[PDB]
Enzyme design. Structure first.
Site, PDB file in Angstrom:
ATOM      1  N   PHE A 208       0.762  -1.133   0.159  1.00 28.79           N
ATOM      2  CA  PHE A 208      -0.025   0.027  -0.098  1.00 28.79           C
ATOM      3  C   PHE A 208       0.987   1.372  -0.037  1.00 28.79           C
ATOM      4  O   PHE A 208       1.805   1.211   0.950  1.00 28.79           O
ATOM      5  CB  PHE A 208      -0.983  -0.015   1.180  1.00 28.79           C
ATOM      6  N   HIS A 211       0.742   7.431   2.105  1.00 30.82           N
ATOM      7  CA  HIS A 211      -0.451   8.250   2.447  1.00 30.82           C
ATOM      8  C   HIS A 211      -0.492   8.983   3.862  1.00 30.82           C
ATOM      9  O   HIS A 211       0.315   8.613   4.608  1.00 30.82           O
ATOM     10  CB  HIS A 211      -1.846   7.232   2.464  1.00 30.82           C
ATOM     11  N   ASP A 213      -3.519   9.291   6.874  1.00 29.04           N
ATOM     12  CA  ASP A 213      -4.750   8.634   7.137  1.00 29.04           C
ATOM     13  C   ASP A 213      -5.759   9.983   7.281  1.00 29.04           C
ATOM     14  O   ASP A 213      -5.691  11.083   7.631  1.00 29.04           O
ATOM     15  CB  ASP A 213      -4.705   8.200   9.008  1.00 29.04           C
ATOM     16  N   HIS A 267       3.065   7.520   5.836  1.00 24.30           N
ATOM     17  CA  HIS A 267       3.383   6.264   5.913  1.00 24.30           C
ATOM     18  C   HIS A 267       3.009   5.388   5.039  1.00 24.30           C
ATOM     19  O   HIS A 267       2.143   5.739   4.133  1.00 24.30           O
ATOM     20  CB  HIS A 267       3.062   5.854   7.376  1.00 24.30           C
TER      21      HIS A 267
END
Ligand SMILES: CSC[C@@H](NC(=O)[C@H](CS)NC(=O)CCC[C@H]([NH3+])C(=O)O)C(=O)O
Ligand SMILES: [Fe+3]
EC number: 1.21.3.1
Length: 328
Positions: A208, A211, A213, A267
Site C-alpha cells: 500500500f 498516504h 490517514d 506512512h
C-alpha cells in the site's frame, strides 16, 4: 533503513482521576506527535490476543458465497447502499488484500441519520450467525472496547495541546460517531503474484502506497510482522512491530485543526509474504462536528484555516484515498 523512534507510552493514567499523572502522559503524546508522529499505547486494557483469534477464525472460515453476499458496491452492484460497510474482496492473481469493515453499532434502521440517508452513515451487514457463532457480538463489543481506549487517548491529546480534557472527546459520542473498524487480512500466497506487489520510487516493494490517514487519530492493532514505514526528515524509517500494543498516529483532521503542529505522518506498507492482520480503528467524530481550527505555536492561538465539518472531511477524504492508492 534505520529504525523509527516509536516510544511505548503507558496510557493507563488516562482512564483515571490523577490529573498530574495525566499531564505526564500528555507530554509523552506531545513529544511523539512532534517527532515521528507515532507511538505505541501500552497498558491499554484491551484483550488483543482474543481480538486476533476471533478475527482469524472469521477470515479463515468465511466462504466465497458469503463474501459476495456481504460485498460493498465496488464489488457487487446489487448493494448500492454499501459504500463503506461490508466485505472488500481479494482478486486472486491481482489483488492480495481482503477485509471487512463495520461502523457504529448504533447506526440501526431507526437512527435519524440512517432514516435521512445521510452520506457516510450505513447499517452494518453481518454474516450468518449459524456459520459464525458469536462473531457479531464479539465485533460489536470490540467496537466499544476500542471506543473506550480512543476516548482516553483523546483526553491525552487535548491536554497535550493545552486544552481541557474533553476538547475532542465531547464530539466523539456513542450515538453518532462515524468511527470504523476494518479487519484486514494480508495473506501468505505461494506464488505471490507480481501484479499484487507495488514498487515505490526508492525501490521498496509495497502492498500500500504512501498516504496520510483520513481520521482524527488512528488506533491500530497489527500482528508481529514488521511492515510499516514512516517518512521523516531523515527519510523513510522502519516501524517496529509490537502485537501487544496499539500503534497510534494522527490523521489529517488533527493536522487541519492544529495547523500542522501535530502533522498527519506520511506512512506506507511494505510487501511481506506473510499471513497477517492489520486491524485499524479510525477515530472519526460526528457528521456535524466542527472544531474551530487553532494554532498552538502562535501566541494568540489563532489559525488561518477555515472550519470544516467532520462529515465533509470524511466523505471527501475517503474518495480521495481511493483515487490515490486504489480501491481496497
Ligand atoms: C498502515 S495503513 C493501515 C491499513 N490501511 C488502511 O486501513 C487504509 C490506509 S490508513 N485506509 C483505508 O483504506 C480507509 C478505509 C476506510 C473505511 N473503509 C471506512 O469506511 O471507514 C493497512 O494497509 O495496514
Ligand atoms: Fe494509514
Amino acid at each position: 533503513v534505520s529504525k523509527a523512534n516509536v516510544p511505548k507510552i503507558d496510557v493507563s493514567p488516562l482512564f483515571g482521576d490523577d490529573q498530574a499523572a495525566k499531564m505526564r502522559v500528555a507530554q509523552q503524546i506531545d513529544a511523539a506527535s512532534r517527532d515521528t508522529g507515532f507511538f505505541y499505547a501500552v497498558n491499554h486494557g484491551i484483550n488483543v490476543q482474543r481480538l486476533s483469534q476471533k478475527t482469524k477464525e472469521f477470515h479463515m472460515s468465511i466462504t466465497p458465497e458469503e463474501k459476495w453476499d456481504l460485498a460493498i458496491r465496488a464489488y457487487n452492484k446489487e448493494h448500492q447502499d454499501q459504500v463503506r460497510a461490508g466485505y472488500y474482496l481479494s482478486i486472486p492473481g491481482k489483488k492480495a488484500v481482503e477485509s471487512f469493515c463495520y461502523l457504529n453499532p448504533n447506526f440501526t434502521p431507526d437512527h435519524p441519520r440512517i432514516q435521512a440517508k445521510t452520506p457516510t452513515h450505513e447499517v452494518n451487514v453481518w454474516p450468518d450467525e449459524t456459520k459464525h457463532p458469536g462473531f457479531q457480538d464479539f465485533a460489536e463489543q470490540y467496537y466499544w472496547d476500542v471506543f473506550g481506549l480512543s476516548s482516553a487517548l483523546l483526553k491525552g491529546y487535548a491536554l497535550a495541546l493545552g486544552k481541557e480534557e474533553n476538547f475532542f472527546a465531547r464530539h466523539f459520542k456513542p450515538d453518532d460517531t462515524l468511527a470504523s473498524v476494518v479487519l484486514i487480512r494480508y495473506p501468505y500466497l505461494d506464488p505471490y503474484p507480481e501484479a499484487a506487489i507495488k514498487t515505490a520510487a526508492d525501490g521498496t516493494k509495497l502492498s500500500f502506497e504512501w498516504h496520510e490517514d483520513v481520521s482524527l487519530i488512528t488506533v491500530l492493532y497489527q500482528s508481529n510482522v514488521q511492515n510499516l514505514q514512516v517518512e521523516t526528515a531523515a527519510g523513510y524509517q522502519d516501524i517496529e512491530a509490537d502485537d501487544t500494543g496499539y500503534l497510534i498516529n494522527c490523521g489529517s483532521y488533527m493536522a487541519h485543526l492544529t495547523n500542522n503542529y501535530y502533522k498527519a505522518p506520511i506512512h506506507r506498507v511494505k510487501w511481506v509474504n506473510a499471513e497477517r492482520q492489520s486491524l485499524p480503528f479510525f477515530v472519526n467524530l460526528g457528521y456535524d462536528s466542527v472544531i474551530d481550527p487553532f494554532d498552538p505555536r502562535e501566541p494568540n492561538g489563532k489559525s488561518d484555516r477555515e472550519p470544516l465539518s467532520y462529515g465533509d472531511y470524511l466523505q471527501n477524504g475517503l474518495v480521495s484515498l481511493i483515487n490515490k492508492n486504489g480501491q481496497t
